[PDB]
């Protein structure tokens, strides 16, 4: 004869989601006490190991349903945006400009620079002053010497406040207390399917919000082999993630000692602007080690013949074309904005059986974050000096439609969907609840006493 | 079953160049994932042409020949797309169709719920 | 190889019957199904999951095994007749029309 028993305490989970706490180093607050990514306060990053192996236990992953990813993707963006809530309202600022080129210029007939001075206020309303600030080219219209912010009819241009820094910190996730998030100790997983080996652990760790399009940048390596990870094959809608298992430094600069004018526009409303720039003006681009770029194409190659077979040719192409986000790459540097030329890198086909790639980039001050209609940032000019040292580890690319009369497939960057940035980051972990009440059968029969 | 507000049909030179366009609420337009155009000769089946994302304009294409004679542009703040095609040759007479796919997971497979009534173009002497 | 192919073709149908359908297909992609006549846009009519598009008035369905799909039309009524394609993803089949 069986009887029931409870057991309190047993470890078993199921599937679930839950907000995840934020965690940080303190650290990187108490040197950037404005910085965006830094919490004012926040959990420990709880950097101590996996107390458990889960010896003989598998589970299944499907990164694509992950919804911590949203939960990521929304703390960003809401962070981003109080941050910059109160700085400036600049909207009143669009006024009719007027000018021509810049003339005595030492230059590098670039249309690049253009001296640009309009009318203002002040601090005070009865009182109006010149300001003659430059801009870039992407940053203006025609009304043909007439001229008007691009994003005027906007709902407004806000200056980002030059007191918040933009460098990317890192974010851990921590689970509540009664849920815990499972990590998959699989070498080079889907990121999908059954894992082999699990392990648990308190928090997340070495995510970091970086921002790119075509290139993943500052991200984790495959510890084995080039990993090709897509939510389908057949379905040219979905992007893959190529993930490198070595990186690939870029160097990237900007001239050349752009100085700041700081402009009162009303009381206490500043507004920093470019100034007189100093010496010779060069185009802004990026380095990529050629030699390098071989070794990594050459092994994505091989990865992607394992989909399409070993008698296909794979050729890469530049972009199909759309927003100019889509087309070029971009990245944030020393605070400054830049959008890329990456043709360089995929005029090539590569066919079964101290040198360098120099990429074009210009810069511009306006920008409209994760797609955002009718609303914009200003970026304020760094002051003359951008380094930039990078590691590129992967890209974001799409294969081209249609039929075949061939094995040869094309392949081109594509995505601009930030939320697959984080994907990246993200696939090695599951969140799951632990469920304290157990049933199981016994001999005792609680015999009663009293 | 919202029918998609179609441009109106006409005649063309070869060598030509048309513009076709196709327009929709802001709630259909917010709701669109993929904009998709397909054509379909006379006497013939229904070609898929290419598609534009709502989102970022990038755009995948069906056969190079219609890569290079062919772009797809969105605007997102009049909720319309258009489709430029040029170099147009008496092959391409045609009825072109603007359709909408709302489908945004894996394994749910392609669709195409709204369809405008489609255009007529012809291309003569 | 084509990758999509459609049967059995053109067929006379008789009203009362279940009419059938069917394409098959390379690769395992999902299949789904559009009906049109003419001077008329398509209308959905069969999900990838087989799962009936709004707007049918519950008169069609279907299922597969392997690389074939096949759909059933309910009672050949005449108000189906039409031209029939079976669609995955970037390729359409020939088609089929239904006749009395």
């Known amino acids: 004869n069986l009887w029931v028993t409870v057991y309190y305490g047993v470890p078993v989970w199921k599937d679930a989601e839950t907000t995840l706490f934020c965690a940080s180093d303190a650290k990187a607050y108490e040197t950037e006490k404005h910085n965006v990514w830094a919490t004012h306060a926040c959990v420990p990053t709880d950097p101590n190991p996996q107390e458990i192996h889960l010896e003989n236990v598998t589970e299944e992953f499907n990164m694509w349903k992950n919804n911590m990813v949203e939960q990521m993707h929304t703390d960003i963006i809401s962070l981003w945006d109080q941050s910059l809530k109160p700085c400036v309202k600049l909207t009143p600022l669009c006024v009719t400009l007027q000018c021509t080129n810049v003339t005595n210029a030492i230059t590098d007939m670039r249309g690049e620079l253009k001296n640009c001075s309009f009318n203002m206020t002040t601090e005070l309303r009865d009182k109006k002053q010149k300001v003659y600030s430059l801009f870039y080219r992407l940053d203006v219209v025609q009304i043909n010497k007439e001229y008007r912010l691009i994003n005027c009819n906007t709902s407004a241009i806000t200056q980002a406040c030059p007191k918040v820094s933009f460098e990317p910190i890192p974010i851990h996730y921590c689970a509540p207390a009664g849920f815990a998030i499972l990590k998959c100790k699989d070498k080079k997983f889907n990121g999908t399917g059954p894992c082999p080996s699990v392990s648990t652990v308190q928090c997340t760790h070495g995510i970091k919000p970086v921002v790119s399009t075509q290139l993943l940048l500052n991200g984790s390596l495959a510890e084995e082999e080039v990993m090709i990870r897509s939510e389908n094959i057949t379905n040219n809608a979905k992007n893959i993630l190529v993930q490198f298992n070595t990186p690939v430094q870029i160097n990237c600069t900007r001239p050349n000692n752009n100085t700041r004018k700081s402009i009162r526009i009303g009381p206490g409303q500043a507004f920093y602007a470019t100034g007189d720039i100093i010496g010779d003006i060069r185009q802004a681009h990026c380095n990529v080690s050629k030699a390098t770029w071989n070794e990594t194409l050459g092994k994505v190659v091989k990865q992607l013949r394992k989909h399409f077979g070993n008698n296909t040719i794979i050729r890469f192409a530049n972009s199909s074309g759309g927003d100019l986000e889509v087309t070029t790459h971009s990245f944030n540097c020393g605070g400054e904005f830049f959008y890329c030329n990456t043709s360089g890198l995929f005029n090539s086909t590569w066919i079964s059986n101290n040198d360098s790639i120099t990429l074009p980039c210009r810069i511009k001050q306006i920008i409209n974050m994760w797609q955002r209609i009718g609303q914009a940032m200003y970026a304020p000019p760094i002051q003359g000096v951008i380094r930039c040292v990078s590691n590129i580890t992967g890209l974001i690319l799409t294969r081209d439609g249609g039929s075949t009369n061939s094995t040869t497939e094309t392949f081109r960057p594509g995505g601009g969907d930030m939320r697959d940035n984080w994907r990246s980051e993200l696939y090695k972990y599951k969140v799951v609840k632990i469920e304290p009440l157990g049933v199981a059968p016994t001999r005792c029969k609680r015999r009663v006493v009293g | 079953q919202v029918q998609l507000v179609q441009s109106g049909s006409g005649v063309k030179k070869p060598g030509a160049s048309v513009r076709v366009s196709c327009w929709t609420s802001?709630?259909?337009?917010?709701?669109?994932?993929?904009i998709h155009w397909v054509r379909q000769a006379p006497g013939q089946g229904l070609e898929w042409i290419g598609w534009?994302?709502?989102?970022?304009?990038?755009?995948?294409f069906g056969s190079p020949d219609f890569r290079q004679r062919v772009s797809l542009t969105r605007d997102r703040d009049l909720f319309t797309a258009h489709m430029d095609i040029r170099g147009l040759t008496q092959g391409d007479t045609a009825t072109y169709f603007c359709?909408?796919?709302?489908?945004?997971?894996?394994?749910?497979?392609?669709?195409?719920?709204?369809w405008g009534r489609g255009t007529l173009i012809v291309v003569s002497s | 190889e084509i990758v999509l192919t459609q049967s059995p073709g053109t067929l006379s149908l008789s009203p009362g019957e279940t009419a059938s359908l069917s394409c098959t297909a390379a690769?395992?992609?999902?299949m789904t199904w559009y009906q049109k006549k003419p001077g008329q846009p398509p209308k959905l009519l069969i999900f990838?999951?087989?799962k009936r598009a709004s707007g049918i008035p519950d008169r069609f369905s279907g299922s597969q095994f392997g690389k074939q799909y096949t759909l059933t039309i309910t009672r050949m009524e005449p108000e189906d007749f039409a031209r029939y394609y079976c669609?995955?993803?970037?390729?359409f089949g020939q088609g089929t029309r239904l006749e009395i």
């Open positions: 359709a909408r796919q709302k489908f945004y997971t894996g394994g749910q497979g392609w669709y195409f719920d709204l």
């Open positions: 690769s395992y992609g999902h």
């Open positions: 990838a999951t087989s």
């Open positions: 534009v994302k709502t989102v970022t304009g990038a755009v995948n």
């Open positions: 802001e709630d259909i337009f917010e709701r669109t994932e993929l």
């Open positions: 669609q995955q993803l970037e390729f």
